[PDB]
């Protein structure tokens, strides 16, 4: 997909390059694809996209700035100060001073303004100002500009939310995931209405059944208390503890809670999963269709470049000339559809990527060396030798240099395996800063051995699906990560500074009894790890009840309830659906192979 060919080529070379771009799945913007003589501006798109590493690093730096900012509750002069990290159970990360914050923010905002406005070089100005995405992005950058200025001039701060929104808007797969999710919301709110109806009715039966009992006097003291406890019991996280008083009062009480948990878990939760799975499949099919439409648009523009006369047909001589300008670098009458089909048949079967400009047993040799390295490592840990780990590190950098010599980097880097092996080998060699942690990097290379279980048919599908999932779950896990970043910023804004060694109420909260005091919202990394504990649903109601006690209001539970409803019942059920569909796709592939 040579930028040279799209820019300068003879039209048959532009057509071959558009064909290759399309089948590689990396299309040009339609604003370029449609502008007739698009080569005059595609030059700018290519130079723009060559810098993608710099832009991505800017957006990751902008997102990570949230982890190093001082909590706003520390600014309003606590006694003692947040220098007494032990008093506030704070983390280890540094908090930026004002000078460092200004420098960081100025640099990242400058690169963000450059990235956001450079598209005006190839999208026409009238197209730029009419893209919805550009207008939202410009709104975000102007909010960050205001928030930078409003303290460079020296209730809450808006910046940390806008940084996450900009991050979402900057990665195509996150935008796609949020578009997908927006189609699922409507159907999800219906089953949520039925789930609420289930909780409300079950909690009313429970309440009136236990009204004068010890369960009533000690647990189900009111309808709202019953509904709260029954909601937590839907998660099973309080399972026996909540109804022990009934079981002490009558062993027959267990029948109610058995029925309730059996129906709630094995029927309602699984049906919520099934609804999320149906909706996911429908929206993914809509996405795939849209990408196939874009692919056709590109192939049709290539046909419009070979057609120099607008008669909507191509002849033998134009066809063979295109066939040479295709087969020489990238791999009778015809029409638009015949051309698109005939082209896609090459990708279907004949297509192999050619090597860009500038032995089988070797894999077995390195497999032997790395398995010897693994046995040497284990016999070292059991103490049954730095020269071995050194010679292995040397052999791994030799393998990397040999590959990049014999294949060339633009070929080498294409493989998902070796592009990892390269990074970890580089980290290994740059770790020679003159610690034992290089043991774990060496085993991070050793994990490549697991691919050999794909040679064993009883393991081939499982391992192959796992390898496929490692990259392909990244948009979904990244969306969950962005939801956590937003919930973290909210939590630190509303709960920061309540968990402190002088609080006195704290030492009654259950957070103290379970020794969870480091899992607090006083700090951004603290909040992130706490939100991971909540996402795991393990002992999760401890935090909810403790912060209810520390804030003194029931409204605090809205945070934890909404977090549960968004993350568990939706996004993780999405991850389940995605993994199941991936496995079944791998089986359908092998059923075509076998």
């Amino acid at each position: 997909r040579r930028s040279e060919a799209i820019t300068h080529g003879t039209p048959f070379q532009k057509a071959a390059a558009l064909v290759d771009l399309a089948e590689d799945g990396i299309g040009l913007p339609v604003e370029i694809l449609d502008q007739s003589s698009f080569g005059e501006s595609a030059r700018y798109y290519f130079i723009f996209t060559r810098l993608d590493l710099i832009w991505s690093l800017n957006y990751f730096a902008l997102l990570f700035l949230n982890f190093f900012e001082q909590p706003l509750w520390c600014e309003k002069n606590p006694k003692p100060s947040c220098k007494d990290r032990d008093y506030y159970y704070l983390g280890e990360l540094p908090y930026l001073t004002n000078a460092e914050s200004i420098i960081y923010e100025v640099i990242t905002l400058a690169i963000l303004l450059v990235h956001t406005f450079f598209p005006i070089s190839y999208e026409g100005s009238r197209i730029f100002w009419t893209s919805r995405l550009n207008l939202v992005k410009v709104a975000c950058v102007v909010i960050l500009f205001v928030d930078v200025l409003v303290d460079f001039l020296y209730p809450f701060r808006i910046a940390p939310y806008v940084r996450v929104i900009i991050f979402i808007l900057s990665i195509r797969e996150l935008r796609d995931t949020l578009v997908l999710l927006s189609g699922m919301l409507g159907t999800y709110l219906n089953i949520l209405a039925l789930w609420m109806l289930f909780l409300l009715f079950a909690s009313w039966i429970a309440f009136v059944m236990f009204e004068d009992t010890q369960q009533g006097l000690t647990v189900f003291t009111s309808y709202g208390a019953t509904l709260y406890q029954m909601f937590i019991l839907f998660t099973t996280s309080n399972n026996p503890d909540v109804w022990i008083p009934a079981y002490k009062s009558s062993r027959w009480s267990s029948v109610f809670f058995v029925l309730y948990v059996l129906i709630g878990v094995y029927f309602v939760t699984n049906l919520i999963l099934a609804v999320v799975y149906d909706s996911f499949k429908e929206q993914l099919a809509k996405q795939v269709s849209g990408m196939d439409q874009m692919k056709r648009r590109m192939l049709e523009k290539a046909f419009g470049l070979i057609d120099s006369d607008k008669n909507g047909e191509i002849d033998k001589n134009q066809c063979i000339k295109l066939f040479e300008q295709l087969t020489n670098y990238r791999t009778f009458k015809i029409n638009k559809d015949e051309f698109a089909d005939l082209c896609q048949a090459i990708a279907l079967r004949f297509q192999k990527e050619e090597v860009p400009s500038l032995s089988p047993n070797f894999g077995y040799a390195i497999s032997f060396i790395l398995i010897i390295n693994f046995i040497a490592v284990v016999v070292e840990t059991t103490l049954n030798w730095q020269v071995a780990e050194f010679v292995f590190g040397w052999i791994y950098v030799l393998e990397m240099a040999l590959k990049i010599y014999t294949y060339g980097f633009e070929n080498y880097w294409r493989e998902g395996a070796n592009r990892f092996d390269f990074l970890v080998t580089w980290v290994i060699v740059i770790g020679e800063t003159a610690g034992e942690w290089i043991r774990y990097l060496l085993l991070a290379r050793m994990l490549r051995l697991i691919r050999l279980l794909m040679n064993v048919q009883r393991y081939r599908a499982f391992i192959a699906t796992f390898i496929t999932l490692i990259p392909s779950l990244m948009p979904y896990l990244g969306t969950i990560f962005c939801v956590l970043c937003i919930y973290c910023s909210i939590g630190v804004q509303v709960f920061g500074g309540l968990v402190n060694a002088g609080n006195k109420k704290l030492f009654e909260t259950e957070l103290a009894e379970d020794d969870y005091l480091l899992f607090n919202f006083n700090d951004y990394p603290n909040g992130m790890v706490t939100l991971f504990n909540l996402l795991v649903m393990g002992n999760w109601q401890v935090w909810m009840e403790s912060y209810k006690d520390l804030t003194g209001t029931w409204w605090s539970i809205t945070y934890f309830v909404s977090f549960y409803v968004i993350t568990i019942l939706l996004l993780l059920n999405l991850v389940v659906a995605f993994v199941l569909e991936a496995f079944f796709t791998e089986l359908d592939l092998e059923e075509e192979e076998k």
Copy 2:
């Protein structure tokens, strides 16, 4: 589906009856179907199957006997005796005396012998002794006969296991579910091998990484301790608690446990579910194919009762004579396959089942009366009237009597709704022994109102799937119940009497700290409720660690590990797969309908 017609009919009536049986799915045993004459052999099968209510009650009574037997540890003279139920945290169910046990066992064994040998009246004796199922059943009855005699004559008792086996063998749906499961076992053991490999490698990294740390000195003290703790962490049930010492020592320690839990839950557990789902689908398809083959065998014998000429074809006169024997009672040449196809088409395109021998607004009227009953109940609980509950109970028995008059019972009882409404109305009217508990029975009748949400398209599929799942999950939930019964019997045999008020070690045991002492294995109902808590996976490691401490051996954990592997990773993943496939089938049905 008329016993009279098969037994005594003119051959065209036998053929019509075999057709109708086949389309209801009542496969006559092939020893009859292959008999070459549906003679007295068929008569005995019908009289045998008329008693199915007595046989089912006998098998349920035989299974339930386990709940009322004295624990064998009570027999070996404890000090104090099991009369001090408080000292042993025992349940409320009575324990049968020896006399009552003998009477119960003699009655149930007599009916079991009658049921097991009566098939020799219609199966030939030469077939009876060559059916594998009969031989296994006869082995179980001879084991129970031995175990009855050996204590009527007056280490462990075998009877409670054989009772569960007999129960499984007596219900066709349970035999089906177990033969289904036997095809899934082979594939399940491979992913278990990979799951063990994952645990072993992760626990070795964890062990060597923390070796000299507080996490090492206090939690990961040895490789076996690390593996045990990392296995529990795979369940998430100890999630933060197990790695707090690392997080106190370095906040960066969280990265390891985050990665571990993320991969374990979101990759490996979902891939296990996916593998179980693929295997379930393949085995269910094999089952359906077998039932369709039996249906064809029946229709082929119906054809063979017409074509005594061995034409391979039925003529017009034979065809129309059959057509009246079919369509006057139960709803050119045709070959054997044309006959089977035509019949299976008629089962769709014309058949509405006729009424057996011997208004639309009424549904709205009773819906109004029962919704008024609901509002009258709620305004009674808030005390905003026994005559209301009386008049409503009267109207419900009136509706039942009117239905069974106007439809006839053999027609009435066929509906899954009204067959429940009948039972609960009967329990209501026999409950008029004068208690307020009838409130919940009227509410149970009121639950039928939820079917009206099927009139709302946004709710139809979910509600309809739920209604379909209520009966169709019974084979699977019953299989889980039988596994629980076997594990309960084992647990009571190995752990009974350890949880007692004089144990002294018990009060260190965490079982005593969480107040779980009523959740013990001293008794069969106690064990069943405990195993339900384990199946729910809430705080489940409490019992495992507690019984490790109380028995003083690591071998005790084998019980809990194997229970987890069998019930949670397999059978509940089967329930998930079944619910998902049910929902998707309901959507496919509606998309075929709309």
